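Protocol step 4 of 6.
Sequence for Beta-lactamase Class D Cpin_0907 (Chitinophaga pinensis DSM 2588) entered exactly as in the expression construct, tag removed. Do not edit the line below.
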Amino acid sequence: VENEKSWEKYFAEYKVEGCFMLFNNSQGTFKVYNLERSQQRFLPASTFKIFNSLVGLETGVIKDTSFVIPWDGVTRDMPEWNHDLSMQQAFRVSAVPYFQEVARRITKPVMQHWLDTVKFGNMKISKIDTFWLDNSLQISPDEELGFVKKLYFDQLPFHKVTMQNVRQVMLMEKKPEYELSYKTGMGFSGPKTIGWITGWIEENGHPSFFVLNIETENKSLDMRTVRMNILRNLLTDAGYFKGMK
Ligand SMILES: *C(=O)N1C[C@H](NOS(=O)(=O)O)CC[C@H]1C(N)=O
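Step 5 output, structure tokens:
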């Protein structure tokens, strides 16, 4: 593990705290800003959709990535969500109600079995449809990094087609120079807003795994935009987006 202290630049620019972890498979380099935070636990918020999708597909609650759960007719603050959505659409717009219904169909005893089998964070369920957003379940950035690396390499205890389907829906940006796959998250913990982006970037078929975790006590900061700007600035600094990795 190399300590990359210059990455503080991109967090200080937004007056936030955070860590960044970057594992470049092909060059065998592993860089981390804020090692202490990388070992601290936080609620996963919407990054848990990776796990929920895996278990939903594996148990067969979700038939395939086109599987539709209708809108329940409850109008929510995000217009994207007030529709009948396929798994792929719900994942990409981060539609919480889709995955709350997945969790209820999985059921708490089955969910607990899969948390325990994968050894996912503190493995703690409060309520079946809130536990990844209400600060009961917690996971560290280093744990999220290990999890997505195992997902990429088919090392989790799921069927290969289950894991291929989740990798496919995680693909968010594709150019000839790079393919960027990730899941974002945002949650609340005490006075703090916690932001996540977990995923990988592939250039020439070579993956680099990353986890970004940020926090602020400034209630007026736009975490949704700031987390993405910070990720793009960090990966640009590290030499990505040009097809050279
Ligand atoms: C997940 O963290 N959430 C669902 C939704 N989209 O989040 S994302 O942009 O982080 O993927 C809004 C934020 C958050 C929530 N409020 O539950």
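Step 6, annotate. The pocket of NXL is lined by residues 45-46, 94, 96, 133, 184-187, 224 (CB under 6 Å).
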